[PDB]
């Protein structure tokens, strides 16, 4: 049904609203493939052609938020796939021969570069995923799944769906960011999420529940313990 | 009873002899420690070390449930000094106790410890913000009364508003003063008022003047001189627009006239402010 609305250039606002509704329905039931198929089917140059109203600005903001969430999910999946395919160590064998020793030496020499390349690619993927998560969370003019215009119609069901999707995406994104920071060895960046999820600039503490808060508190303590065991303290500062 | 000096001198000699024999027997069999503790009910520091050097988690509880006030001594011995995690959790009682309180199911205690650490810290703005955020998260996760939750939220919002005046510094002044981004100390209200109305802040508009005057309630020397200095700086920076904007945003007897003067624009601006404030 979205193709019939995308093929008509007169109903651009209707096509954008249908695409936003499809993206919200796919995100409410965890349908990344359906969201990607809807985003690839929707027109990419429609924002530069439909231009304003309350029903149009809110739809454009919802589409931008859905695209940012899809990009952050695709980057996180790529980072996880790159981290889950690290280079293995050399196969050690007892009582080797002259050729076996040379083979083991060559394998160890190649591993010295393989592990370095895998660490560099993993760090790049983690830095990209962190930026994607930051852009998806800290959004200008309101926030994630927040309508900037307050003069639309009576869309109580749409508002409830957008609030539920935002509440379901905030804890998952926070957990993904915490896992990425723990895997990349960023204890200071992992322990700094408590202030971002509690400051009044974004009001991220209202979307989380008791279980999400308990998980965040358990992750912060585990990060502080690792930071203190590595050589720092709880928050990562130097113990003078 | 009488002659307490001799009893105090003999106690130290008796405690020093038991500690030396427990150090030489710790490298051999561990079965002699229980026999020594059963023979002489003293020197718990050796038992606390024997129950911590190995992976015997039930020994510390068995030696504490069948004694008299053993947990208070064990905590004092741990704070003054699998198995490693248990030792760290037992030693974590002071300073870094938020993780222990969160692990032992004590959200209110963790929030109180975080608030105390944030109040005692005054040399790291990033650490002070992280501690405040952790305390706010713990207070939000704690299932307390509605009045207590509202009071905690208000106390967190007050601290956030007090710290924002120093955290919202200009990017030009911080780069001109060669100051660090997150490796800076907790600046006071007077230091913030002096930095916000300094000569390095070239882009000092109405917000920089309104933020400096609102930090006068957190001084706890002479605010009358600072109020005149800020008013003189706001008038000199306009190159006789900023004074009228500040007066419109503040809406009136806190400012002075002769004390601030010791001329044509001030006399015309002071006449319009008396009619709008009455």
Curated annotation (Swiss-Prot), chain A:
Changing residue 205 to C: In NPHS11; decreased function in nephrogenesis; unable to fully rescue morpholino-induced nephrogenesis defects in Xenopus; decreased interaction with NUP133. It is found in: Nucleus membrane; Nucleus, Nuclear pore complex; Chromosome, Centromere, Kinetochore. Coiled coil: none annotated. Ubiquitously expressed in fetal and adult tissues. It is linked to Nephrotic syndrome 11: A form of nephrotic syndrome, a renal disease clinically characterized by severe proteinuria, resulting in complications such as hypoalbuminemia, hyperlipidemia and edema. Kidney biopsies show non-specific histologic changes such as focal segmental glomerulosclerosis and diffuse mesangial proliferation. Some affected individuals have an inherited steroid-resistant form and progress to end-stage renal failure. NPHS11 is an autosomal recessive, steroid-resistant and progressive form with onset in the first decade of life. Plays a role in the nuclear pore complex (NPC) assembly and/or maintenance. Required for the assembly of peripheral proteins into the NPC. May anchor NUP62 to the NPC. Involved in nephrogenesis. Part of the nuclear pore complex (NPC). Forms part of the Nup160 subcomplex in the nuclear pore which is composed of NUP160, NUP133, NUP107 and Nup96; this complex plays a role in RNA export and in tethering Nup98 and NUP153 to the nucleus. Does not interact with TPR. Interacts with ZNF106. Belongs to the nucleoporin Nup84/Nup107 family. This is Nuclear pore complex protein Nup107. It comes from Homo sapiens (Human). The chain holds residues 674 to 924 of 925 of the full protein.
Swiss-Prot record, chain B:
Disulfide bonds: none annotated. Widely expressed in fetal and adult tissues. Expressed in the brain and kidney. It comes from the Eukaryota. It is found in: Nucleus, Nuclear pore complex; Chromosome, Centromere, Kinetochore. Involved in poly(A)+ RNA transport. Involved in nephrogenesis. Forms part of the Nup160 subcomplex in the nuclear pore which is composed of NUP160, NUP133, NUP107 and Nup96. This complex plays a role in RNA export and in tethering Nup98 and NUP153 to the nucleus. It is linked to Nephrotic syndrome 18: A form of nephrotic syndrome, a renal disease clinically characterized by severe proteinuria, resulting in complications such as hypoalbuminemia, hyperlipidemia and edema. Kidney biopsies show non-specific histologic changes such as focal segmental glomerulosclerosis and diffuse mesangial proliferation. Some affected individuals have an inherited steroid-resistant form that progresses to end-stage renal failure. NPHS18 is an autosomal recessive, steroid-resistant progressive form with onset in the first decade of life. Belongs to the nucleoporin Nup133 family. This is Nuclear pore complex protein Nup133. It comes from Homo sapiens. The gene is NUP133.
């Amino acid at each position: 049904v979205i193709d019939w609305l995308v093929f008509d250039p007169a109903q651009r606002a209707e096509a954008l609203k249908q695409g936003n509704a499809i993206m919200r329905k796919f995100l409410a039931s965890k349908k990344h493939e359906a969201a990607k198929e809807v985003f690839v089917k929707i027109p990419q140059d429609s924002i530069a052609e439909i231009y304003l109203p309350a029903e149009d600005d809110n739809a454009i903001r919802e589409h931008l938020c859905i695209r940012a969430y899809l990009e952050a999910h695709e980057t996180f999946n790529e980072w996880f796939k790159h981290m889950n395919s690290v280079p293995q160590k050399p196969a050690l064998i007892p009582q080797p021969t002259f050729t076996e020793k040379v083979a083991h030496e060559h394998k160890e020499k190649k591993y010295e570069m393989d592990f370095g390349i895998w660490k560099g690619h993993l760090d790049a993927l983690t830095a990209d995923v962190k930026e994607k998560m930051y852009n998806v969370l800290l959004f200008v003019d309101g926030g994630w799944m927040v309508d900037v215009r307050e003069d639309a119609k009576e869309d109580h069901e749409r508002t409830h769906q957008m609030v539920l999707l935002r509440k379901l995406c905030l804890p998952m994104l926070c957990f993904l960011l915490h896992t990425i920071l723990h895997s990349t060895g960023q204890y200071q960046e992992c322990l700094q999420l408590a202030d971002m999820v509690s400051s009044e600039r974004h009001k991220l503490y209202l979307v989380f529940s008791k279980e999400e808060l308990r998980k965040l508190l358990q992750k912060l303590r585990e990060s502080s313990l690792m930071l203190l065991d590595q050589g720092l303290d709880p928050l990562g500062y130097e113990i003078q | 009873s009488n002659r307490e000096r001799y009893d105090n001198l003999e106690m130290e000699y008796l405690q020093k002899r038991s500690d030396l024999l427990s150090p030489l027997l710790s490298l051999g069999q561990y079965l002699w420690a229980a026999s020594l503790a059963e023979k002489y009910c003293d020197f718990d520091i050796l038992v606390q070390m024997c129950e911590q050097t190995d992976n015997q988690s039930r020994l510390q509880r068995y030696m504490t449930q069948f004694a008299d006030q053993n947990f208070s001594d064990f905590l004092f011995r741990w704070y003054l000094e699998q198995h490693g995690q248990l030792a760290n959790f037992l030693q974590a009682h002071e300073h870094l106790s938020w993780l222990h309180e969160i692990n032992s199911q004590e959200l209110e205690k963790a929030h109180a410890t975080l608030l105390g650490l944030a109040n005692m810290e005054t040399r790291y703005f990033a650490k002070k913000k992280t501690l405040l955020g952790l305390s706010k998260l713990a207070a939000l996760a704690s299932d307390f009364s509605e009045d207590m939750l509202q009071e905690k939220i208000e106390e967190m919002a007050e601290q956030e508003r007090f710290l924002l005046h120093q955290e919202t510094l200009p990017e030009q002044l911080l780069a001109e003063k060669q100051l660090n981004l997150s490796a800076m100390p907790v600046l006071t209200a007077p230091q913030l008022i002096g930095l916000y109305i300094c000569e390095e802040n070239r882009r000092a508009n109405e917000y920089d003047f309104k933020k400096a005057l609102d930090l006068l309630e957190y001084i706890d020397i002479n605010i009358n001189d600072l109020k005149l200095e800020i008013l003189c700086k706001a008038l000199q920076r306009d190159n006789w627009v900023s004074k009228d904007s500040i007066f419109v945003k503040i809406l009136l007897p806190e400012v002075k006239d002769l004390l601030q003067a010791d001329e044509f624009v001030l006399k015309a601006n002071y006449e319009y402010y008396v009619q709008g404030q009455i």
